[PDB]
Amino acid sequence: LYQFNPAFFQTTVTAQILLKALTNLPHTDFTLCKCMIDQAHQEERPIRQILYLGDLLETCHFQAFWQALDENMDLLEGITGFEDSVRKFICHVVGITYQHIDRWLLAEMLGDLSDSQLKVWMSKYGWSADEQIFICXXXXXXXXXXXXXXXXX
């Protein structure tokens, strides 16, 4: 509706839609929303900034994400569970890309959590510390015969 009726473009609603889309990664939500916003609008504040943050998440640069994330950002205050939703995506990626992982590193990637908070996420996905946090004939013959015959022929 905003793309088709430009005068109605609402910055806050657009930003919330994009942020909520990010909370739904690894799904394609965030990418679909981008398909629905033209270049001019993507380049405007704070849409540009939000897309930049999303980019850090998509490219899985988690440390950079948390660093660049203005924790006290206005738009984030009303988006309930935003930070934890992001963590779910991170744990989704971690469960796929690591066999074992340093306890300190995981807490960093999850947004510099206390040991107590880290425990909450390890518990949620069933990860445990080890040494560290524990995370994780006849037919063939016939075929050859045929192939051989074909070759001979």
Partner 1 sequence: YFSLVGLLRLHSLLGDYYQAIKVLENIELNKKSMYSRVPECQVTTYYYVGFAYLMMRRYQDAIRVFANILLYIQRTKSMFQRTTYKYEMINKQNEQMHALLAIALTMYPMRIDESIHLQLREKYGDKMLRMQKGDPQVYEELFSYSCPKFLSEPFLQQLKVFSDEVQQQAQLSTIRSFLKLYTTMPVAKLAGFLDLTEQEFRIQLLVFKHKMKNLVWTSGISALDGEFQSXXXXXXXXXXXXXXXXXXXXXXXX
Binding site for partner 1 (CB under 8 A): 3-4, 32, 35-36, 38-40, 42-43, 59-61, 93, 96-98, 101-102, 105, 140, 143-144, 147, 150-151, 153
Least distance to partner 1, CB of residue 110, Å: 16
d(CA 140, CA 62) in angstroms, rounded, equals 49
Work out the burial of residue 28: count CB atoms within 10 Å of its CB; fewer than 13 is exposed, 13-18 middle, 19 or more buried: exposed
Question: CB-wise, 39 or 116, nearer to partner 1?
Answer: 39
Least distance to partner 1, CB of residue 25, Å: 13
d(CA 153, CA 138) in angstroms, rounded, equals 23
Contact assessment for residue 132 and residue 102, using Cβ atoms and an 8 Å cutoff: yes
Least distance to partner 1, CB of residue 123, Å: 22
**DSSP secondary structure string for all residues of 47-107:** HHHHHHHHHHHHTT-HHHHHHHS-TT-HHHHTSTTHHHHHHHHHHHHHHHH-SSB-HHHHH
Least distance to partner 1, CB of residue 31, Å: 9
Least distance to partner 1, CB of residue 76, Å: 25
